[PDB]
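Pinned message: reference record for Tyrosine-protein kinase BTK
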Amino acid sequence: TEAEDSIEMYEWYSKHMTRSQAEQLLKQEGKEGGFIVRDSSKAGKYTVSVFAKSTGDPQGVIRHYVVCSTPQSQYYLAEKHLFSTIPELINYHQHNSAGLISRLKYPVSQQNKNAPST
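Predicted structure (tokens):
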């Protein structure tokens, strides 16, 4: 098995962050690809709130990806594939080689409109 919940809490992580608060703070931050996460309740799974300004909504796109869990100690956003934890799933999604130097897109939470813009 594998866990992940701990003291860690940079920005993308948030204790019970409202999906709507993520969308507004996401669009408000203006980071194309903002990424946030919060605990659920029914399955006790995690939800990833990410947004961007370059898609169906060129000026503000958002979507909360959640993880479903089956009674076989597994999780997934689509039964097509499922791991034993949310973090394990997200990591299994990228699995890219030496190309970048950091996962996730922009660590933003309930409120953190920084936007370095360089």
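Pinned by admin. Summary line: The chain has one domain: 1-118.
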